[PDB]
Structure 1
Amino acid sequence: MKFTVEREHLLKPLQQVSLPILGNLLLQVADGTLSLTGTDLEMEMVARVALVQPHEPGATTVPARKFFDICRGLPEGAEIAVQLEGERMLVRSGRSRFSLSTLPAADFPNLDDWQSEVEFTLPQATMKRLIEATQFSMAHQDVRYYLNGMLFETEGEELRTVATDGHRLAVCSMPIGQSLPSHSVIVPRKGVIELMRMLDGGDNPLRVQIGSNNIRAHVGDFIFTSKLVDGRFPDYRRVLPKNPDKHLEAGCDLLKQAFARAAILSNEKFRGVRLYVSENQLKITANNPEQEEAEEILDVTYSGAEMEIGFNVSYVLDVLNALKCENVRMMLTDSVSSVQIEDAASQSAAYVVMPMRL
């Protein structure tokens, strides 16, 4: 295996792809192409680079971080020459020389072959919107493994994401402009994070392939694959309040800043605030073990019956930070029922949050 390539052409590929052998990148030269693969057994990223300079086919594996750091550490405009010599891989550029250890390409974990069942293309921006709208509501290390991740659901012409931790839920639906089969899978949180990471903000569309046990995403000359998670993910439709009769509308940023200020004097371990809704007004209060008190009064749009209800501060701020909008609607039922929160100008996403007793 031998190739010479500009550092420039390796930088982005290495960034995306980076048991001892799982700390190594697979390098493969074949058919005028260098392929680079990184994996952790649960997911893999493959990147390809074209090779115009003389090259020789073959494959080996090398320490991912060290190889990346060496390539990154070389000067801008550097040419990187690589040749395989037994148990070492030689890397040369200018008068900088490196010998890295290797493990055989034959030993490299190959994620089992699988079969695509559902396929579609969508804009990068749509995937970004879907993930950012809901990712914060995924569970972290819940014993219910299937909540430590994100539901991806196809229905009609929409792709939908759902995330929940049992206390709050986020759902977002976006058009993809193709009639799609009804289907849903759970992508583990680490997979969701890497999927987000591969979206660079340009116009490259994403090609998605969903199998019975895997999901794959193609963008540019990168291919990402992740295993899926087994489980009965809850139905968001059953979580949405059936008949909210009390409607508050307020400035998103005004509400966010009032919550954030009040939270300063809430209990440090379980930060919550009490809301009192009455005619044209929201009052937010907090107190702590030291008997310190905060109070915020806001002029709001509200005409239903008076009620008091508590919320976990972080759950509400998480939603308001996700909304990034002018006005927010809160749809309430009673003091012991969950609340629905939405951007007043968008029906693409909805949030449900349990009340908190204080």
Structure 2
Amino acid sequence: DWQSEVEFTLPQATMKRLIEATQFSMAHQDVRYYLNGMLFETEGEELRTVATDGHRLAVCSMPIGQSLPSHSVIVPRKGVIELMRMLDGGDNPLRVQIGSNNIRAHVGDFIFTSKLVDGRFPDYRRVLPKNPDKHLEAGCDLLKQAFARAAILSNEKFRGVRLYVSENQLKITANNPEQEEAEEILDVTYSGAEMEIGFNVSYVLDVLNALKCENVRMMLTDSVSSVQIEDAASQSAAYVVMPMRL
């Protein structure tokens, strides 16, 4: 017995990209039960996948070419992990079935079934900063290498880096409970006021890993608001990192 509220006929590589964009920013056994999963949203010809845990947000909004009614459901962490475990990089036309309570996927010769979390996912639109005035655009690989270099001495129990933004140079500074300092400098093109902003280097590195592009743009508002990260030449997926207190 099944009433398909929302039916997708979508390439399996497309949803592979969608989930891989937002899989890492997910809550594991969090107190907020509605966050222990991932939001599937449907808006016209656009499919959106949102995932957050209170410190990260990852939204991937991709057109599919087929128009569907707007909808929003939450699939638990186990279901999406199982889907990724089963999803491959082929050409089989995947078929998503969205009902009132369950998620189903016909994938070539396999069927994936799961329940849905009974809750309302938070509105991601207000999480995104509303004044993305400052822009840091730099090569993705250079940023990844610099962050990994600064995170070499960072501990698992203390993982966090401070970004000093200046006229051109971007400084990444990392400390540790052992009280030893690491510093990296980059020639990112920028124009704005000097600022200091602290984030967990693991989350930023995961965001960069999710972006397989030549360069990225970070949108910044002030020292206490969240930072957005996006492809400098595409708007298919955006990421939000909440700053840490210093």
Is TM > 0.5 for Structure 1 vs Structure 2?
yes
Please state how far the C-alpha of 1:276 moved relative to its aligned partner. 0.4
In 1, the alpha carbon distance for the partners of 2:64 and 2:154 equals 43
In 2, the alpha carbon distance for the partners of 1:311 and 1:289 equals 17
Greater relative contact order, per chain length (Cα 8 Å cut-off, separation 6+): 2
1:259-318 superposed Cα distances (whole Å, 9 cap, x missing partner) = 111122335412101110000110111122322111111100110111011110111001
Q: 1:263 corresponds to which residue?
A: 151
SS at match of 1:302: coil
Identity level (%):
100
Q: Is the 8 A contact 1:152 1:186 kept in 2?
A: yes
In 2, the alpha carbon distance for the partners of 1:269 and 1:119 equals 44
In 1, the alpha carbon distance for the partners of 2:6 and 2:155 equals 47
SS at match of 1:136: coil
Match of 2:89 among 170, 188, 201: 201
Please state how far the C-alpha of 1:326 moved relative to its aligned partner. 0.8
In 2, the alpha carbon distance for the partners of 1:200 and 1:300 equals 36
1:203-222 superposed Cα distances (whole Å, 9 cap, x missing partner) = 11011111000011101121
Higher strand proportion = 1
Please state how far the C-alpha of 1:178 moved relative to its aligned partner. 1.2
In 2, the alpha carbon distance for the partners of 1:184 and 1:298 equals 40
Change (3 A) 1:282 1:217: same
1:334-357 superposed Cα distances (whole Å, 9 cap, x missing partner) = 111100000112110000000112
Q: Is the 8 A contact 1:114 1:214 kept in 2?
A: no
Q: Is the 8 A contact 1:262 1:295 kept in 2?
A: yes
In 2, the alpha carbon distance for the partners of 1:247 and 1:173 equals 21
1:165-222 superposed Cα distances (whole Å, 9 cap, x missing partner) = 0111000011221111000100011100111222221111011111000011101121
**Root mean square deviation of aligned Cα:** 1.2
1:64-90 superposed Cα distances (whole Å, 9 cap, x missing partner) = xxxxxxxxxxxxxxxxxxxxxxxxxxx
TM-score of the pair, normalised by structure 2: 0.97
Q: Which moved more, 1:162-171 or 1:189-198?
A: 189-198
Q: Is the 8 A contact 2:158 2:177 kept in 1?
A: no
Does residue 318 of the first structure (1) align with residue 206 of the second (2)?
Answer: yes
Please state how far the C-alpha of 1:160 moved relative to its aligned partner. 0.7
Change (3 A) 1:267 1:201: closer
SS at match of 2:143: helix
- Highest Rg: 1 or 2? 1
In 2, the alpha carbon distance for the partners of 1:290 and 1:125 equals 45
Please state how far the C-alpha of 1:229 moved relative to its aligned partner. 0.5
Please state how far the C-alpha of 1:226 moved relative to its aligned partner. 0.7
Q: 2:44 corresponds to which residue?
A: 156
In 2, the alpha carbon distance for the partners of 1:315 and 1:285 equals 16
TM-score of the pair, normalised by structure 1: 0.67
Does residue 167 of the first structure (1) align with residue 55 of the second (2)?
Answer: yes
Does residue 295 of the first structure (1) align with residue 183 of the second (2)?
Answer: yes
In 2, the alpha carbon distance for the partners of 1:174 and 1:195 equals 19
Q: Is the 8 A contact 1:245 1:304 kept in 2?
A: no
Q: How does 1:65-214 map to 2 (within 5 A)?
A: 113-214=1-102
Change (3 A) 1:268 1:126: closer
Please state how far the C-alpha of 1:245 moved relative to its aligned partner. 1.8
Q: Is the 8 A contact 1:138 1:163 kept in 2?
A: yes
Structure 2 stretches of 5 or more lacking a match? none
SS at match of 1:270: coil
